[PDB]
Design a protein around this ligand. Structure first.
Ligand SMILES: CC(C)(COP(=O)(O)OP(=O)(O)OC[C@H]1O[C@@H](n2cnc3c(N)ncnc32)[C@H](O)[C@@H]1OP(=O)(O)O)[C@@H](O)C(=O)NCCC(=O)NCCS
Ligand SMILES: CC(C)(COP(=O)(O)OP(=O)(O)OC[C@H]1O[C@@H](n2cnc3c(N)ncnc32)[C@H](O)[C@@H]1OP(=O)(O)O)[C@@H](O)C(=O)NCCC(=O)NCCS
Ligand SMILES: CCCCCCCCCO[C@@H]1O[C@H](CO)[C@@H](O)[C@H](O)[C@H]1O
Ligand SMILES: CP(=O)(O)CC[C@H](N)C(=O)O
Ligand SMILES: CP(=O)(O)CC[C@H](N)C(=O)O
Lengths: 175, 174
């Protein structure tokens, strides 16, 4: 049982703690330096009206986050979003990641986006199989795109497509 | 004249060249023409870590080739993104591939691991220039952009180098 809701500035210290754990312990994230809560708050405020940012509360505690942002800052990409999801390392494999992402994707689809792209640092079987279970299709892979944790790691692109006409209408904000 | 390092005085000419493709083609996914200072801010920020080159003909800028970061996360630091534009008239005089060759030999010498090109499709000329220089097709996003009345895919081409492990810091252009 998890309350899926919109992320607030008060959730960011907890979100920052979760993601920092994977930055240090895993190559799932290509950052090599932990983040501070305010950097997270800055991205949220800048993106939450235009892209969905969701947290999952469990027993009053933040147990995961799923958020979206722009793929690239050029206008033709405006209908292309990038998605991300992180679950606390003690609440994994309980369905929170899929529940968060399902809510994220329905918002993105209702808003009028064309597609959603996921950038997965490989290897990462849990994230690959979750994304492919929710309809993401493999699209590409850059070889040795990053050096983290003493090795070169490929990065893969997964994409989930929605149906839009020609021309597409400007996408709706979250509200 | 000829091929040299880009200066702040070259940016207006560079901006005029690229704006031509912003306004008339889908090889780049901007819909809003640019202003020379956005180029100047990038040049000054990057010219010491990444090569920024211009080609001259008759003392006039005829094309630019530059590299920059692929993604702003430190693991990507040995991965560069490459770009090249030639003025409409100077196309098919060996300028592009010659510009790109000098750009690539600098990136390999500085100690980068690979070079990535993001090509908005259709773009048969660019696909061919890149694969002729050793780039391999590595992926493609479907209908990633809408411009000029249609959806357009975008493809990724990659040129791989070889580095020792752990890799040393990339050397500056100087
Ligand atoms: C990837 C992640 C978000 C998955 O969320 P989750 O809540 O743990 O997984 P779920 O309970 O929602 O399960 C959904 C599907 O994900 C897959 N999956 C999740 N964990 C898996 C694991 N260890 N091994 C194999 N498949 C796994 C399964 O296909 C699962 O389907 P199933 O439960 O019906 O068998 C979670 O593992 C995580 O936070 N990893 C660290 C951060 C990360 O990698 N984020 C992805 C960035 S690309
Ligand atoms: C793409 C571009 C840099 C090619 O460089 P160029 O100076 O025009 O062409 P070059 O003579 O230097 O040679 C480059 C190679 O690419 C191919 N090529 C170049 N122009 C081509 C054209 N109109 N049609 C088909 N192939 C072409 C050719 O294989 C050519 O080799 P070739 O001389 O043996 O035919 C240039 O045409 C350009 O600026 N195009 C528009 C902007 C652009 O597409 N940038 C790509 C960013 S991803
Ligand atoms: C390519 C310049 C990288 C700048 C962006 C990353 C900032 C934090 C780490 O920087 C390091 O600085 C070196 C330059 O001396 C690089 O060679 C090295 O790979 C990179 O890990
Ligand atoms: C490999 P990367 O660090 O570029 C992105 C990882 C993850 N999808 C996220 O969005 O954090
Ligand atoms: C299709 P896009 O606009 O993302 C990049 C086009 C060209 N590689 C460039 O860097 O100008």
């Amino acid at each position: 049982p998890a309350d899926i809701r919109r992320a607030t500035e008060a959730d960011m210290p907890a979100v920052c703690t979760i993601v920092n754990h994977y930055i240090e312990t895993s190559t799932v994230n290509f950052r090599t330096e932990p983040q501070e809560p305010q950097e997270w708050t800055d991205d949220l405020v800048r993106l939450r009206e235009r892209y969905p940012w969701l947290v999952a509360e469990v027993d009053g505690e933040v147990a995961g986050i799923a958020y979206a942002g722009p793929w690239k800052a050029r206008n033709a990409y405006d209908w292309t979003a990038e998605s991300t999801v992180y679950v606390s390392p003690r609440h994994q494999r309980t369905g929170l990641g899929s529940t968060l992402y399902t809510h994220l994707l329905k918002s993105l689809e209702a808003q009028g986006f064309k597609s959603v792209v996921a950038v997965i640092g490989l290897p990462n079987d849990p994230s690959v199989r979750m994304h492919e279970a929710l309809g993401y299709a493999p699209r590409g892979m850059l070889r040795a795109a990053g050096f983290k944790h003493g090795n070169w790691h490929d990065v893969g692109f997964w994409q989930l497509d929605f149906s839009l006409p020609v021309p597409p209408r400007p996408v709706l904000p979250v509200t």
